[PDB]
Amino acid sequence: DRQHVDALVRMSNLVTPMALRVAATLRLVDHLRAGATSADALADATGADADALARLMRHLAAAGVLEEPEPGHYAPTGLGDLLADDHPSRQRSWLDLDQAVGRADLTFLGLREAVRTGRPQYEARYGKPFWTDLSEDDGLGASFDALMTTAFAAPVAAYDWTRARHVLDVGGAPGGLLTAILRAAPEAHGTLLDLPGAAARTRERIAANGMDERIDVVGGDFFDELPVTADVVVLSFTLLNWSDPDALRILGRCRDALRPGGRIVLLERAESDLYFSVLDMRMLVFLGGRVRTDREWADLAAAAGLDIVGKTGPLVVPLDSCLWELAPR
Amino acid sequence: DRQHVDALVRMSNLVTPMALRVAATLRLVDHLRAGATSADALADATGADADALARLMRHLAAAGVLEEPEPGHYAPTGLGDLLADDHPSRQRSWLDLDQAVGRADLTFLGLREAVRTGRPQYEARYGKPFWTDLSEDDGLGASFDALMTTAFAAPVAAYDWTRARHVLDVGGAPGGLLTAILRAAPEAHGTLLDLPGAAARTRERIAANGMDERIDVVGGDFFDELPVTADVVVLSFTLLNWSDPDALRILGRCRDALRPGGRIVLLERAESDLYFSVLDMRMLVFLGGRVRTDREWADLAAAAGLDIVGKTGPLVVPLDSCLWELAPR
Ligand SMILES: Nc1ncnc2c1ncn2[C@@H]1O[C@H](CSCC[C@H](N)C(=O)O)[C@@H](O)[C@H]1O
Ligand SMILES: Nc1ncnc2c1ncn2[C@@H]1O[C@H](CSCC[C@H](N)C(=O)O)[C@@H](O)[C@H]1O
């Protein structure tokens, strides 16, 4: 069928999504807006090949991203203007192959192996798994944090944080949630554990915010014994990026760190199809893990020797969240 | 702007084009049509991971390729039925990562390096350049030839082949054009040169067609001295996949092989934007070369010590062709 074939071919297009990411990485639209509109001028500005750049811009013009106001000279359309570095959509940074999201999206090249094995393929491409790479590379981690900002009031209200004297945030970088908890709970002291590079950036952030007397930052690995005990151990959007066997290892380390009467608190994603499926596929291919159902959290808790003693949610940012309270059996 | 942002994000989608290729490679829709419709049944049939397959099919359902008639059981939509192996669109084979086109399309992962260097990136990924890989791998070469079939009457009529006693087809696999020329020219004998693996497949084809007394097949490299002299040396859709420096090397070998009075004959692509640009981008990234203008062919001929003594075209299959006659100066 002609309509079906044309639809499938449009849906199969790898050239345009790659062309957009290369253009973003080259700051192509910024150069065009500055008057470097020929392939030769763009080659001088970027270091790339003039003939190949001409062919790239021909393609982006055919896709409606650019126009050709003079022979051999390109300029952004209204659509292409979204790739300007200062555009409020930040689409240039979402697509930039030298920032964390564009870099990670290239791992979809390895989708066949992700589907064969069920394992993420970012480490296969880059030599370190995703969170470790962003920790060890200040530029990558900071770029991810900047994009993902675009007040933690709901989780601060959803739990009585004034009853917790010592709080340990496991995988807590960049420290926004723990900072909000402690500003609402004067009697609480915090410890934040994350990988060493991410922890160092968080330590600098906390000091610049005047919270270094309220929060100790520790660089380390949450698959290892945790560095302190605590009355509440917080896992905020951490377990969702791990398999059930790995999440059980993390929960075990957290349960071992509980003081008498202590609790583990999960802040997690709550349990249109296309948007949610793209997020799920990013989890399969490079972020790790999956979004669990309420039943799956109960099963995970039981396998960790934990009772679910409370759930508060949905907490309503495009996605909703849930706060879970877990206690040792 | 909301409309622009939504358009750019749709255009940026790498998940769906990769999901389609993985599904094609797994023969997923064929398995569903055979009743293996759960992730567990599909894992048994394919060897892939059941949980990852479930997430793949969720995505393809969200994209309109599949539906979920029973909980946990998927089936193709009318769109998805195009991925059945026996569908006349052959879209499963166009997308199959174990056939030549899907395998090559993954090289668009390396578009950044193609744009930086101007060089194709297939050899970087697979260890051999495209035509060499298809020559050395009978399955890949045969899959490409089968897809690209979907009578050579125009080029046979466009030149007086009855005046050529000895014809050499340089890069002539799979041999269709030379076979058509010789069936129209009783006084002509042919020699066909291609890489050894492609030449062996062509030799078998020619023998099965009863043309082995009319055509000698030689395995070799057209950057080397050619194996025979000839009255007409034919380059049919060969020079377009090479840079000007490489095309000049090939033209030099061809000019050296001309008998007195001999001619070189080019059958080439003639000089909607989106379709042609995708073809151009495939040339940049893995096929090699570019489509030249009439002016560029004249410049190439002059740099090779050749006069253009005739052009016959356009010859009208979606694309048009041109026949060029070249003579030593
Ligand atoms: N093995 C490990 N040990 C400690 N932290 C880890 C880790 N693997 C991943 N992480 C950290 O897990 C965090 C997940 S994203 C940050 C979640 C944060 N608690 C929030 O609410 O937003 C990252 O900061 C990452 O560096
Ligand atoms: N170095 C080389 N030496 C000989 N043949 C080569 C070669 N590099 C590529 N080729 C061959 O060039 C051909 C280009 S496609 C085949 C073109 C054919 N003449 C036609 O009309 O359809 C392929 O068969 C490929 O194997």
Residue numbers in the entry:
A (entry chain D), B (entry chain D): 22 to 171, 176 to 296, 305 to 349, 353 to 365
Direct quotes from the study:
Tailoring steps catalyzed by SAM methyltransferase-like proteins have yielded particular insight into evolution of anthracyclines and generation of structural diversity. DnrK is a canonical S-adenosyl-L-methionine (SAM)-dependent methyltransferase that catalyzes 4-O-methylation in daunorubicin biosynthesis. Here we have taken advantage of the natural diversity of anthracycline methyltransferases and employed extensive chimeragenesis to probe factors that govern catalysis and substrate recognition.
The specificity of EamK and related 10-decarboxylase TamK lies between DnrK and RdmB, since anthracycline aglycones and monoglycosylated compounds are accepted as substrates. TamK has been shown to catalyze 10-decarboxylation of 4 and 5, but not 6 (29). The SAM binding site is highly conserved in the enzyme family with the exception of the 10-decarboxylases that contain two mutations G189A/K190P. The structure of the binary complex of wild-type TamK and SAM confirmed the interactions between the co-substrate and R4 in 10-decarboxylases. However, the distinct proline-alanine pair in R4 alters the conformation of the Cα main chain in the region and leads to a movement of 2.1 Å in comparison to DnrK. This change coincides with a 1.8 Å change in SAM positioning, which is the most likely reason behind the lack of methylation activity in TamK. Two-point mutations G189A/K190P in R4 are sufficient for misalignment of SAM and loss-of-methylation activity.
